Amino acid sequence: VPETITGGRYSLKDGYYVYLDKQGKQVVGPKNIDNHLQYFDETTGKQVKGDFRSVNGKRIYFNANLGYADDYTTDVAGKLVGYDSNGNQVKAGYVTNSQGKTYYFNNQGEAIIGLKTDNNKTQYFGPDGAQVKGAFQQVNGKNIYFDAQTGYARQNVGFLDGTAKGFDEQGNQIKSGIATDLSGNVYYFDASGKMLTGVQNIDGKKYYFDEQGHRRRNYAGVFNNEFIYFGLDGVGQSAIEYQFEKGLTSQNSVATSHNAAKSYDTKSFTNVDGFLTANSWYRPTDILRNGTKWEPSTETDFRPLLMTWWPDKEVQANYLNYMSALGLGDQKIYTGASSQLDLNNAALIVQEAIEKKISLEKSTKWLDDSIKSFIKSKRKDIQGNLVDTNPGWTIDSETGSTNHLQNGAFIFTNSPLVPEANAAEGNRLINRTPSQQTGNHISYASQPYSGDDWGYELLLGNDVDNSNPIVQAEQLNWIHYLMNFGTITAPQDPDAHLANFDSIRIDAVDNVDADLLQIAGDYFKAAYQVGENDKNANQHIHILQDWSPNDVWYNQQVNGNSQLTMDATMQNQLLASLTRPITSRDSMKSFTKDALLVHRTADNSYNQAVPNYSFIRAHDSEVQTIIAKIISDKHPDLYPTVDKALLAKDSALYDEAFTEYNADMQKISSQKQYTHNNMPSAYAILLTNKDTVPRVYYGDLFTDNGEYMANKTPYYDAITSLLTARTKFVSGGQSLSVDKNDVLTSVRYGKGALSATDNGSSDTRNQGIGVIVSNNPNLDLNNDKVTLSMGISHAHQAYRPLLLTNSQGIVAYATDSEVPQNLYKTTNDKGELTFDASEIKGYDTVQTSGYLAVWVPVGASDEQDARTIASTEKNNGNSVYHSNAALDSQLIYEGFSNFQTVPSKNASADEYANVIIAKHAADFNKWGVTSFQMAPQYRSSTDGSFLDAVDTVQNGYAFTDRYDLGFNAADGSKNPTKYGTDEDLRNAIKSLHAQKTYDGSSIQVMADFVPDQLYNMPLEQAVSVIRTDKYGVNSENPDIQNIIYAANIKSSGTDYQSIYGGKYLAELQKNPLFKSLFDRIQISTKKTIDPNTRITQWSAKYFNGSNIQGKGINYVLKDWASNKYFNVSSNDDMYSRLPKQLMNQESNTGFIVDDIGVKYYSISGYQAKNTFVEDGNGEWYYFDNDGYMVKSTEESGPLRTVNASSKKYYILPNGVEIRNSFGQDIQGNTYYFDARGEMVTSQYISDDTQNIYYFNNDGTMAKKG
Ligand SMILES: OC[C@H]1O[C@H](OC[C@H]2O[C@H](OC[C@H]3O[C@H](OC[C@H]4O[C@H](O)[C@H](O)[C@@H](O)[C@@H]4O)[C@H](O)[C@@H](O)[C@@H]3O)[C@H](O)[C@@H](O)[C@@H]2O)[C@H](O)[C@@H](O)[C@@H]1O
Ligand SMILES: [Ca+2]
Ligand SMILES: [Pr+3]
Ligand SMILES: [Pr+3]
Ligand SMILES: [Pr+3]
């Protein structure tokens, strides 16, 4: 029996492929994988490809490609018999040889020769048993074509031996009949097999065939002195006879006096900056009260606009149907074809029911809902699928680039139609990432390091413009508010000064103007004199979220080191070499490469390395992506891509995924299908490393979901043992190594000593840790020995373990006395430890793959602390921080996860995280924490536009009011954020501040500074928009070029932004210490910061752009004839006046034939001037400056420039402007006209049937033959 293997990937060794087991081991012999049987060689473990092996007796062939077992025919004599994939002979069925020959065998097992007439699909087989595909074969002069993929007879035209000969399925030449090629080309022949070109009459219907014989669609031109237009049918339509309904329909009714608007100004209409939308309501002069008596309307008698007016018949019809479905309208179906007068009468029948329902309910809220759902309603199509009923008012119409986290984006631009949503000149500078701050990319990177930039301006939601000086100021104000949160929010309290934040984490560095880094750096020199010395600097440790490789070096040269850069090379190497499964895993020798940021192979100096903070996981990185992977595997239907699974927001899915994620964390390393292996081995390297500030993720001590701090991970004992050990032993110089067996040994020599040869100080002897790490579950040393080279400072010294590994797990020893006598071992005269195979071997537990050990020196006191005090001396150079003993004494703790359960409305006091933080304050001080990175404390949105904004998470990165950190409601209801109230928060900070570290100063508390975006904003505003991707590159959709959009982009002006916005700028300017900050010329703007305007209400002029909101392109209402937007707040001529019916004026709609020409009036009653106009969802027409339709004549040909934009259109004598269509001169030349109706030049245009034509710069088609 070939065993089935399931988990494990393929590898390439020596130019052949091998398969690695879940255990880690190469597989040998005949084995099933992927449901297809493959063989693997006895010694080299090599996969067999295109050879013969014997799996349990029977002779089996394996594919040249993929390695899978397959069919084969061997001809010893006569006809080869042929064999199934699993051995055995074929009694009656197809097999395909490796050469690609396909034979069919009879019941007797001989190869079938000649014709093979199956169950309704005749086939052929030539002599020698091969099937024929893709050629014509005369069985007996039939000349029957056989398909390339299947040997089935097909109708096809064969250009051999003459031209245009057509043959059918049974193989008769199709004289006087229609024939069809493989590409779908349609020929027509005459009696005696010769094809036809030009205009033909087939069944009282005209068709056009070009010069190579193809019957054609969407082709216009004069033929035998008759202008014909052959449509999608291929059928000729008269281009003289009009294609529109002649005659006008009055929109004046008995009811229009009463439904006319009370007034024609802002008073009577609900509006967005004057513009009207689909959800607009208005006050008619009269109300049909209880559907029985016309009364004068009161101040509160507003009704939906859509009740009495619509932008066209198509929406009118659909409205009537939808309300009829809600049981209000009449029981009968209407269409855009249906007559105008009938729709208007039907609408008045609906109104009667609407008002009767309002009288009954004593409310109009039910109506508001049913109008909102009508706008977003869906419908059956001719295909049978769900489309949108009103595409113009949905996401459907906002098509562009997909490259953005929320599937689209806009950029705000200026435009004279919306004067108040226009930004100043030289603002809205996008993509000023650290790399592109000057406006051009600059590689600051040196020789073996990368200098790329993965930044982009539009990340999420509504994107704030941080190239505006007024905004840059409000960002400074917000920092000041946070650094003085306590004193500001609770002035009555005497201890308010203890409830203040100390440092910040700058979020989305690659998505905002990099000027904000220098602004922030200036603040802390002014306020807290961080520049003076290490002591001051290290009391405020800030961090960057700077993912791009180049940002490390930008930070160093441009930004001083005003914030700490992340180490990405370490995180990546720690993930690659330890966390991955055995199949994907990098070697430990990689830790000694050159492309690492900090070389630790012989780190022996201070103030040389780049100041940095390194980590393994974080609330976003390597957390959410793993959950998504599980969602994808469990629900392929809904989410097939790992990227697609990130977009999911349903809690049931996550709940399901987490129970797996939690259950998988418990499993042994070899069967960890989703989670990270070797977590304690990774943290063992991280927390012992020199020249770095380690950051520990909440979710590695505790479970990423559920109650805060409630459930521990498998790794808690190991990691908390390391953290306290860091406090007592880790100091001095470092050196990594990796022996021939691939076993890492990290050594710290202890305070005073910087190398192995250093004799050190008094402090040295009892300090300095030693770490051993292998990532090989099948490690077997045998004769070879592993060596920990401690210093000569540690010669002839007794050492005891801190961590060791068993099959059961990892043993942590807290004190020397907990250690058994046998484990103790003493160093030799050189300061070396030696390890046997009887000691160090391969393991596979839950907590380790390979082996982990950590050894410390025996006889440390309890007062012993390895950490070093910050220097007070002046520092030279430009770095704010300096990577040395004192900085490495610091340690950050990211004390939150996204997926912490959200305490319910009536949750008890101590379910909220900030209460729990206070209770466990001393726990953090015993782990060596000097900075506590709190979550963003801002009130989260719940609209679900992104993971961070769904109600089950509310992590706080998705916020509307960024001065609101959990304040009470207006009535005095406690109203906490996911983590607790402003009071609960202020305590938590005091609690952390009460804790005192090794140097007697408090634990720092870090605010999460999020300058990039704002979510879910209350008030609409009109803006000009262009459809783009995340970089702000124009996706160049014609309909979305500087059009007007009703964006939710304006704050309420009664929120905490209005209270505290820019409040402290005046005050700061007056301070001398801040003079440097305000005088600085910022790199990107080249202008100074501007603190003279306060931002109390956010508005569209302070934003670069926004993610797509799915209001729709035509959500802002607009008369099609005039092609102007409706505006109530202005009496300007660039806006259209209200539809004539709504101001009780005479109004008519329709086409009107006139002696001079043809005029068209919209549903609103206005005349079409200088506009394209679609009719009855079919034909387009253009109307000139004089309000007359443009039509071609005999004197003036069909090819015309109409708009004076140098753009040429093809217009028939109907006035019909043909689109996606070919057109002809009277001379003979052919032109093609694209989706938009305009002529094509210098371009190949493809054809539905795979024909291709080339059109010159001229516009004319290149003729063929
Ligand atoms: O370049 C470094 C990479 O090396 C490894 O590549 C693994 C491959 O994984 C998948 O395919 C698995 C496939 O591998 C062999 O066949 C390879 C291909 O051979 C043909 O040319 C054939 O026509 C192809 O159809 C076939 O894929 C095995 O014989 C076969 O059984 C397996 O199905 C990917 O589709 C490939 O693109 C990869 O090369 C390593 O695993 C990667 O992670 C490395 O990046
Ligand atoms: Ca931005
Ligand atoms: Pr007349
Ligand atoms: Pr349409
Ligand atoms: Pr029609």
Tab-separated table of C-alpha atoms and ligand atoms in Angstrom, residues 9-12 17 33-34 38 40 47-49 64-68 583, ligand 1:
chain	number	residue	atom	x	y	z
A	9	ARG	CA	6.348	20.808	0.631
A	10	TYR	CA	8.636	20.062	-2.346
A	11	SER	CA	12.273	21.122	-2.457
A	12	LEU	CA	15.054	21.338	-5.062
A	17	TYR	CA	13.103	17.510	-6.715
A	33	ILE	CA	0.593	12.843	-2.314
A	34	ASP	CA	-2.000	15.235	-3.771
A	38	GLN	CA	4.556	9.395	-7.394
A	40	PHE	CA	10.893	8.613	-4.721
A	47	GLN	CA	11.477	12.099	-7.397
A	48	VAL	CA	10.944	9.975	-10.454
A	49	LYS	CA	9.914	11.838	-13.603
A	64	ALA	CA	7.761	13.708	-17.349
A	65	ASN	CA	6.156	16.798	-15.840
A	66	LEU	CA	4.667	16.906	-12.304
A	67	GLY	CA	6.010	13.400	-11.481
A	68	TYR	CA	2.538	11.817	-11.349
A	583	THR	CA	10.172	22.868	5.014
B	1	LIG	O1	13.061	28.370	-6.970
B	1	LIG	C1	13.096	28.025	-5.603
B	1	LIG	C2	11.790	27.285	-5.292
B	1	LIG	O2	12.027	25.870	-5.212
B	1	LIG	C3	10.904	25.031	-4.870
B	1	LIG	O3	9.904	24.906	-5.944
B	1	LIG	C4	8.683	24.275	-5.573
B	1	LIG	C5	7.634	24.296	-6.682
B	1	LIG	O4	6.364	24.260	-6.050
B	1	LIG	C6	5.232	24.236	-6.919
B	1	LIG	O5	5.196	23.107	-7.825
B	1	LIG	C7	5.354	21.859	-7.169
B	1	LIG	C8	5.779	20.803	-8.192
B	1	LIG	O6	7.196	20.696	-8.195
B	1	LIG	C9	7.700	19.820	-9.186
B	1	LIG	O7	7.294	20.112	-10.550
B	1	LIG	C10	7.652	21.428	-10.923
B	1	LIG	C11	7.119	21.790	-12.308
B	1	LIG	O8	7.771	20.955	-13.282
B	1	LIG	C12	7.332	21.290	-14.611
B	1	LIG	O9	7.998	22.152	-15.590
B	1	LIG	C13	5.835	21.071	-14.892
B	1	LIG	O10	5.423	21.306	-16.225
B	1	LIG	C14	5.091	21.963	-13.885
B	1	LIG	O11	3.695	21.800	-14.039
B	1	LIG	C15	5.582	21.695	-12.438
B	1	LIG	O12	4.971	22.569	-11.511
B	1	LIG	C16	7.221	18.436	-8.774
B	1	LIG	O13	7.751	17.489	-9.655
B	1	LIG	C17	5.701	18.363	-8.781
B	1	LIG	O14	5.223	17.124	-8.310
B	1	LIG	C18	5.126	19.451	-7.907
B	1	LIG	O15	3.763	19.485	-8.244
B	1	LIG	C19	5.188	25.516	-7.762
B	1	LIG	O16	4.101	25.510	-8.675
B	1	LIG	C20	6.506	25.682	-8.524
B	1	LIG	O17	6.460	26.912	-9.236
B	1	LIG	C21	7.731	25.534	-7.586
B	1	LIG	O18	8.931	25.420	-8.324
B	1	LIG	C22	10.345	25.534	-3.516
B	1	LIG	O19	9.345	24.684	-2.965
B	1	LIG	C23	9.885	26.998	-3.625
B	1	LIG	O20	9.309	27.434	-2.404
B	1	LIG	C24	11.078	27.876	-4.054
B	1	LIG	O21	10.678	29.218	-4.308
